[PDB]
Amino acid sequence: AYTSHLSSKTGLHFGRLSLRSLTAYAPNLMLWGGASMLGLFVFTEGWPKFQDTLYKKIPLLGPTLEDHTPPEDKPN
Amino acid sequence: LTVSARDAPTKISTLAVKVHGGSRYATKDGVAHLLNRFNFQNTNTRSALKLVRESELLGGTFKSTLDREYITLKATFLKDDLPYYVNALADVLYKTAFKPHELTESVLPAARYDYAVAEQCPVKSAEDQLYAITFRKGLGNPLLYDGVERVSLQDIKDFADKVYTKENLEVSGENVVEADLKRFVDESLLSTLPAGKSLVSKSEPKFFLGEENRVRFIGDSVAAIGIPVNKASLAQYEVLANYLTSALSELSGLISSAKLDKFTDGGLFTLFVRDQDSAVVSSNIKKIVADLKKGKDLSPAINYTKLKNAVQNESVSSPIELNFDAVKDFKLGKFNYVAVGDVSNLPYLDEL
């Protein structure tokens, strides 16, 4: 028939932030969290605790990080 | 409350509420312009932002135009949204807010822009000088507000409820069902408007002939002649206006433009000759008046101006229903004259 009005809604927002932009931006900042976690995996590679807990269980880059210096040629 | 419509099997409707509220009816100088620039500001029930951002989502736009006779409130929209737009225009006519912050932030800068853009064209200057020296206090009012006499906000409210009356408006709809438009203009706020007086006068507008005015201006120079026309000889001057600009006349390369503004009680025939140097404008306007003071046979241009009148009455639907067939000859009599620009080298009315 003939439209006399405009039935609308507002939804949810708190200023500049909506939920529609949160839906549009959610998977790419999941990817950003993954990217900076890989950056942490870079920047803590010389750390020994993160080596012996995380970086030496890689199936081909595991034995690359350790010494097997014998317990014979180091003073401590 | 004359409601008229005209159906079509198409997609775009166009409503228009036209009010006899132009410059000719203005109380102070530019009150019609300021009310026109005020038109689609906020109402008492809906903001001006809410109107724009709901009309965009419903698919249509609003406009309002000013000329000497009318204030036209046009709404171009998608065809089956008509009651929204009749209530929008009814709210604009009935209840507009008239806030002084709206006067000082939107309407006065918009009007200042309109005046500054029409000031640079010397043909608009010459046209209003021509109107003002032909008709003095009716149609010769200034068209746009330029602040020579100060218009308050109460002046705009007084002009608004003087001209926004139920007898002083027409409602005209292109591509509208007429029964539904008539049902939607009552059951609306166009039924609650005051049944005032109709401001149009069926008299003759008391013209003056032989007048002359000269205006200094930097840029292009314009020489303009103007002839007031009664209701009877209207179509002879329309044939003349279409003859002088068409290729039938040898004067079409000398005339910058030529038109006939028509009203319900006569009109004004204006002719402008414009360029950048005064010698060519002086030579051309002397040739125009020396050829028009001898006769011009206007009977070749009758079918041409029949076509031109059909074309320009497709856009408007203000029909004046002119004869065109009894038009045989023209000879120039008395005429008003305006020189805008380098007026120390433009000729006077003595030399024409």
UniProtKB/Swiss-Prot annotation, chain A:
It comes from the Eukaryota. Residues 1-20 are mitochondrial matrix. Residues 45-76 are mitochondrial intermembrane. GO terms for cellular component: mitochondrial inner membrane; mitochondrion; respiratory chain complex III. InterPro entries: Cytochrome_b-c1_su10_fun (IPR019182). One of its GO terms (biological process) is proton transmembrane transport. It is found in: Mitochondrion inner membrane. The chain crosses the membrane at residues 21-44. It is a single-pass membrane protein. Keywords: Electron transport, Membrane, Mitochondrion, Mitochondrion inner membrane, Respiratory chain, Transmembrane, Transmembrane helix, Transport. Component of the ubiquinol-cytochrome c oxidoreductase, a multisubunit transmembrane complex that is part of the mitochondrial electron transport chain which drives oxidative phosphorylation. Present with 5590 molecules/cell in log phase SD medium. Belongs to the UQCR11/QCR10 family. Component of the ubiquinol-cytochrome c oxidoreductase (cytochrome b-c1 complex, complex III, CIII), a multisubunit enzyme composed of 10 subunits. The complex is composed of 3 respiratory subunits cytochrome b (COB), cytochrome c1 (CYT1) and Rieske protein (RIP1), 2 core protein subunits COR1 and QCR2, and 5 low-molecular weight protein subunits QCR6, QCR7, QCR8, QCR9 and QCR10. This is Cytochrome b-c1 complex subunit 10, mitochondrial. The lineage of its organism: Eukaryota, Fungi, Dikarya, Ascomycota, Saccharomycotina. The gene is QCR10.
Curated annotation (Swiss-Prot), chain B:
It is a peripheral membrane protein. GO terms for molecular function: metal ion binding; metalloendopeptidase activity. GO terms for biological process: aerobic respiration; cellular respiration; mitochondrial electron transport, ubiquinol to cytochrome c; proteolysis; proton transmembrane transport. Gene3D superfamilies: Metalloenzyme, LuxS/M16 peptidase-like. The modification Phosphoserine is found at S125, S152. InterPro entries: Metalloenz_LuxS/M16, MPP/UQCRC_Complex, Pept_M16_N, Pept_M16_Zn_BS. Keywords: Electron transport, Membrane, Mitochondrion, Mitochondrion inner membrane, Phosphoprotein, Respiratory chain, Transit peptide, Transport. PROSITE patterns: INSULINASE. The keyword Membrane applies. PANTHER family: CYTOCHROME B-C1 COMPLEX SUBUNIT 2, MITOCHONDRIAL (PTHR11851:SF209), METALLOPROTEASE (PTHR11851). Component of the ubiquinol-cytochrome c oxidoreductase, a multisubunit transmembrane complex that is part of the mitochondrial electron transport chain which drives oxidative phosphorylation. Belongs to the peptidase M16 family. UQCRC2/QCR2 subfamily. This is Cytochrome b-c1 complex subunit 2, mitochondrial. It comes from Saccharomyces cerevisiae (strain ATCC 204508 / S288c) (Baker's yeast).
